[PDB]
């Protein structure tokens, strides 16, 4: 019964998921004055030409755009990573107000939203096996600010009415996740966790410095989604973000000078 409400939000998750207080929790604040350039980092390689989106699902916590991950169709490589990581889904976290919504922060700045493209390490065979490994996942995080519309997001926006409530899914084929990337692939990276229960410490985080712009109308449509199921009291799906967690014995590395 974890969530983002008045009585089940992030500050409560540790009772059922004690790693919530662990050594490698996410998100974190990215201090641009202490993150150090690492010349040994490599460009990243985002290969989404062959991506097969399948479906979009309201899971009661966010919505996931799901992909075929039964081949190396959409992979992330390079950067801080060893080996190959398959895209399985992307989702967002967002606010009730434009001044909030992101999970990671940059010098304490909150963005309006944050996109997570989730990939699993093919060495481990399946996502469920991967989340049990410290190097099981690579999550590419992208900040959203409110300004211009993002044309490549509109198809997502326009399907949300069909998945308003928890448990609803819709066919969602032929979506191109390249339309959600900023121009630059400069990034910060650090080791951390899933930001939702079970909060497993299995993630190499790769957070892009350049935000994307979305329009106020696009974010407004995200804020019409519901946490609840159909036939239940309406609870708008807003403020589905976990706040920054202690960095502890970690360093954030920058790919850029």
Q: Which residues bind Zn ion (CB under 5 A)?
A: 116
Q: Determine whether the annotation assigns residue 116 to a binding site.
A: yes
Ramachandran class of 254: left when φ > 0, alpha when ψ lies in -120 to 50, beta otherwise:
beta
- Identify the three-state secondary structure at position 16: coil
Among candidate residues 1, 7, 14, 61, the one labeled active-site is 61
* Cα–Cα distance, 86 to 173 (Å, whole number): 17
Pairing of strands 75-78, 137-146: unpaired
**196 annotated as ligand-binding:** yes
111: its two tokens: 């963005």
Closer residue to Zn ion, CB minimum distance, 104 or 116: 116
d(CA 199, CA 249): 18
Q: How far is the CB of 151 from Zn ion (least distance, A)?
A: 23
- State in angstroms the smallest separation of the CB of 93 from Zn ion: 6
Decide if 61 is catalytic. Answer: yes
Q: Are 118 and 88 in contact, with CB atoms under 8 Å apart?
A: yes
Select from 239, 256, 249 the least CA-distant residue to 113: 239
Positive or negative, the CA dihedral 244, 249, 255, 257 is: positive
> Does 104 belong to an annotated binding site?
no
In angstroms, the CA 239 to CA 92 distance is: 11
Tell me whether residue 116 or residue 209 sits nearer to Zn ion (CB atom).
116
Q: Is residue 189 a known part of a binding site?
A: no
Residue nearest to Zn ion (CB): 116
Angstrom distance (rounded) from CA 183 to CA 208: 10
Which CB, 9 or 38, lies closer to Zn ion? 9
Q: How far is the CB of 33 from Zn ion (least distance, A)?
A: 26
Are the beta carbons of 116 and 90 closer than 8 angstroms? yes
195 is annotated as contributing to ligand binding? yes
Q: Measured from the CB atom, is 37 or 46 closer to Zn ion?
A: 46
Q: Identify which of residues 53 and 233 has a Cβ nearer to Zn ion in the complex.
A: 53
**Shortest Cβ 4–Zn ion spacing (Å):** 12
CB of 242 to Zn ion, least distance (A): 9
Q: What residues form the annotated binding site for Zn(2+)?
A: 91, 93, 116
Q: What residues form the annotated binding site for substrate?
A: 195-196
Q: What residues form the annotated binding site?
A: 91, 93, 116, 195-196
Catalytic residue IDs: 61
């Amino acid at each position: 019964h974890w969530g983002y409400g008045k009585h089940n939000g992030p500050e409560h998750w540790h009772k059922d998921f004690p790693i919530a207080k662990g050594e490698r929790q996410s998100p974190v604040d990215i201090d641009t004055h202490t993150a150090k350039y690492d010349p040994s980092l490599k460009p990243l390689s985002v290969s989404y030409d062959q991506a097969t989106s399948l479906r979009i699902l309201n899971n009661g916590h966010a919505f996931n755009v799901e992909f075929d991950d039964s081949q190396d169709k959409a992979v992330l490589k390079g950067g801080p990573l060893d080996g190959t990581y398959r895209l399985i889904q992307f989702h967002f976290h967002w606010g009730s107000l434009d001044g909030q919504g992101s999970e990671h922060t940059v010098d304490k700045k909150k963005y309006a939203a944050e996109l997570h493209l989730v990939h699993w390490n093919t060495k481990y065979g399946d996502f469920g096996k991967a989340v049990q490994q410290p190097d099981g996942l690579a999550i590419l995080g992208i900040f959203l600010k409110v300004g211009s519309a993002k044309p490549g997001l509109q198809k997502v926006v326009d399907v949300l009415d069909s998945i308003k409530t928890k448990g609803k899914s819709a066919d969602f084929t032929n979506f191109d996740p390249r339309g959600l990337l900023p121009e630059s692939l400069d990034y910060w990276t650090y080791p951390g966790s899933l930001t939702t229960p079970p909060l497993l410490e299995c993630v190499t985080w790769i957070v892009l410095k350049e935000p994307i712009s979305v329009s106020s109308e696009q974010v407004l449509k995200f804020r019409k989604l519901n946490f609840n199921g159909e036939g239940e009291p309406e609870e708008l799906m807003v403020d589905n973000w976990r706040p920054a967690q202690p960095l502890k014995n970690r360093q954030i590395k920058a790919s850029f000078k």
